[PDB]
Amino acid sequence: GAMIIPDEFRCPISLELMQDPVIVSSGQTYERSCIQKWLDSGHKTCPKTQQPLSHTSLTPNFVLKSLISQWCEANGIELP
Amino acid sequence: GAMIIPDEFRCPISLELMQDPVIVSSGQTYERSCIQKWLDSGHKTCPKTQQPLSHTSLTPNFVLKSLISQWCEANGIELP
Numbered sequence: 777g778a779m780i781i782p783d784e785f786r787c788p789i790s791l792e793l794m795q796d797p798v799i800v801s802s803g804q805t806y807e808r809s810c811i812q813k814w815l816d817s818g819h820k821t822c823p824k825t826q827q828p829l830s831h832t833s834l835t836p837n838f839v840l841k842s843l844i845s846q847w848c849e850a851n852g853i854e855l856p
Numbered sequence: 857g858a859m860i861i862p863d864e865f866r867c868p869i870s871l872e873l874m875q876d877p878v879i880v881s882s883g884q885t886y887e888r889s890c891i892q893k894w895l896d897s898g899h900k901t902c903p904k905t906q907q908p909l910s911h912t913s914l915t916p917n918f919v920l921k922s923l924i925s926q927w928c929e930a931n932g933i934e935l936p
Contacts, residue, residue: 782923782926784919784922784923784926799879799915799918799919801913801914801915802915803879803914803915803916803917803918805918805919831911831912831913833883833911833913834881835880835881835882835883835913837883838879838883838884838885839864839885839920839923840919840920840923842863842864843862843864843920843923846862846864
């Protein structure tokens with residue numbers, strides 16, 4: 777293969793391969809490091825979709841992680 | 857390629873293609889129909905993770921949907 781990696785496996789802000797991908801209540805995907813900064817800043821809104829967060833969720837990771845593994849196995853490349 | 861559709865794309869319980877995918881606060885993937893039946897039964901918990909639900913969030917679909925589209929485009933077939 778040796779082709780550009782899919783955008784879904786790279787966070788928009790990161791613009792590179794993510795290490796600890798997670799999902800927010802809004803359903804958007806952000807890097808663990810990034811979300812920590814966001815929480816630290818005291819932000820309670822989602823800038824990507826531009827909507828407020830009136831609730832929290834436990835959703836960490838799931839299908840995306842599984843799909844990444846399948847992709848990695850096909851390419852024979854270890855995960856981040 | 858694409859000999860067989862990904863397990864992730866298929867519902868874990870039904871094991872079939874879904875038209876209205878949703879994710880619980882536990883980040884578990886369930887079919888809209890399945891969730892309605894579960895709710896009708898009076899159950900408000902996550903059996904896969906074995907934990908109760910005390911809140912809700914807006915997480916119907918996101919990256920997962922995007923990955924499906926790429927998969928379908930590769931096969932040149934319309935979405936389920």
